[PDB]
Amino acid sequence: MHRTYSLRNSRAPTASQLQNPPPPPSTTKGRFFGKGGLAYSFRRSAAGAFGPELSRKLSQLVKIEKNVLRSMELTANERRDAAKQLSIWGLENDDDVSDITDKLGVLIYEVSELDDQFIDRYDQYRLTLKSIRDIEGSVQPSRDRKDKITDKIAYLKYKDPQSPKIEVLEQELVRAEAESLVAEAQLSNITRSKLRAAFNYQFDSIIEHSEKIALIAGYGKALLELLDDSPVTPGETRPAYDGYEASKQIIIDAESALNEWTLDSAQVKPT
Amino acid sequence: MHRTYSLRNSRAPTASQLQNPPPPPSTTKGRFFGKGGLAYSFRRSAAGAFGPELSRKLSQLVKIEKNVLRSMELTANERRDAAKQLSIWGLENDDDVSDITDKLGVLIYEVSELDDQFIDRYDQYRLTLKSIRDIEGSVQPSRDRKDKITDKIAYLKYKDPQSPKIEVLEQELVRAEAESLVAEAQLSNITRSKLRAAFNYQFDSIIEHSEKIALIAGYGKALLELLDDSPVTPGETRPAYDGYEASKQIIIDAESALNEWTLDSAQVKPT
Amino acid sequence: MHRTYSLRNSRAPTASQLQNPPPPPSTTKGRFFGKGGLAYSFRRSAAGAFGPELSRKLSQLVKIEKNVLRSMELTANERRDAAKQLSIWGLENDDDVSDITDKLGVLIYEVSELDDQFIDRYDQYRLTLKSIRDIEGSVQPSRDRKDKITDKIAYLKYKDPQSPKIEVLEQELVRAEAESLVAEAQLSNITRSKLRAAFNYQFDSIIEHSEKIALIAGYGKALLELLDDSPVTPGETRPAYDGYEASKQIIIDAESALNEWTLDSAQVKPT
């Protein structure tokens, strides 16, 4: 995190912040709750109350990420609707504005499609986490039985050491202890192997999505040169638009670069 | 778009799709509507019914992108909650799992903060679009007056050419035509100059966010090597964790790279 | 298709569209359904509900193309009626108009006859498709039996592995598997050989019909020069018509060209 040695909510600015000052906080952060939905905030609480004790926090994480997934599909549909609206609105303006808006809407629709693919990959990762949630929830009854049986052993040996079930309960306890030891070993292996794999898949999806949107942004930034900021005096008017071929070539190149992109084609090199 | 010469919904696979087959569609795409909220789908319709005719589609786009912004802040809060839940859940597991989960939660919280910054930039871009929406909505009464006055001229010249207001209405029409010509010129300039600038700012925010999340993904992928997939037999147990310094160095390097990142530091080079 | 990189229903204009702007949409596209008939839209649904599962979409295609054929015979009868009506109406006008209308009606009747011949060829192609529909519908019971028998094998081997019918059912399954393999091979060969042949015959009929109507259109366009656009002042009147021989020669040449036309005589050379 970009925090600092301070007792205030202010954070340490970065190079981008120094070059570009941050905008004021969004006007869409209205004071209702930031909730999004009542079911959104109640599903998590319902999942975190019932079920096995061991599989409680993990179930909460699964439900929270399911809400993440729902909100992401909502924002993907919203963004594709915004692209459609921009494409529709581009008609009323000049030819150059119309073409630029159409290409920008195409790029935003492509971004929405990539978001949907990332949504599918995120659901795959969520199911991978659900598997470990289920196995830990199934493991929990073993240790619950172990503690119940050891409590019974302590109670019987305290109330009457010369009980008829003097050693049968102890032998059952030791075999349950062996079963619980095997269960704990397999739980550790599976949890730690599907955490490092589900999160690896999630990070692969993250980097692929980020690279694709970065390519989209770069190609749109290069396309935006066809639009002109030259202002016209009220009497005058521009000559006819002639940059159709340039826009066509740039969108063809964008599509080709997106198709060619692979895991090894990522230019991001962390240090 | 990655479409193909086909009459089916199937799309042309890319290099990543060929290398990695796509997962099945998400189980969170439940059949209610995909709506998200009733207000979400009614605000747009309300904005697209009233107001000036010219500033109707643009108002719909503004409202749709406001819904985009709300859903994005919702998903940012959801993701930060997921990071907090993962950090909390990391306690119950081994020391290495605890440390890895803590660092992953830190990275996800950083991603959420970057999402919030992108949300602020998106709201700035939305306000930039709102400015052109307002100016076109103010321009529309001029042309509405022009058409009303020309309709009155046609009606008067058809019903009785020798009307007392024979030429005063024509002179008022020509001065209104000059005003409308100036208005159309300034509307074209401002719309086409704030579209190429608001979208340029939006694409700058997009590429910055994408590069930052790509760096986060790469650093997390490099951090995930400290986690081990080696399985332990039920009897045995590992030696104590000793990779604290490696994780500390990798998160310090991630923070330094994020702070150092600037607009010119982007390694994405579109063709 | 002549689509474009756009999010609107507008299509990319062609050279003919640039030279000749497209007319407004037809006034005969009235809002009832575009149905044509209740039986037209219910026959397909009835065919697509019953019958073998494999021979379901193909039966729907056969029924839809039967409706195509019925509507084509309807339009051929309608066009021949239009030609008859034009020939009848030509009497009330001048001699040149009468002769031109008579020859145009002859050409339209010839076009209707060619449409009827194409209708017969289309029905032949539809019967060719019906043959493969029937063979796939007969093949489907084999695989249905195979799945039923393998389901029985799984059920018997799960409920009681030491069943009296331990291996007789397996041997019956393997012989059914051999029969189904032969059936699948022959189905693939026949389907893929009668698709490439029925569609080849259909395309031969298409190109022959198109060339014949193109020759008819060219000959009618050359005949329309006998009609004169010269306007007469109210007092004056033209001399008597004398272009009977020219029209006779042009229709004789049209008939000779239509008779001489063969498959190798087509001047259309695709690239």
Author numbering:
A (entry chain J), B (entry chain D), C (entry chain K): 1 to 271
Paper text:
The yeast eisosome, composed of the BAR-domain proteins Pil1 and Lsp1 (hereafter, Pil1/Lsp1), scaffolds a membrane compartment that senses and responds to mechanical stress by flattening and releasing sequestered factors. MCC–eisosomes are relatively stable, and have been implicated in sensing and responding to plasma membrane stress: various stimuli, including hypo-osmotic shock, heat shock and mechanical pressure, cause eisosomes to flatten and release sequestered proteins to affect signalling or transport functions. Here we isolated near-native eisosomes as helical tubules made up of a lattice of Pil1/Lsp1 bound to plasma membrane lipids, and solved their structures by helical reconstruction.
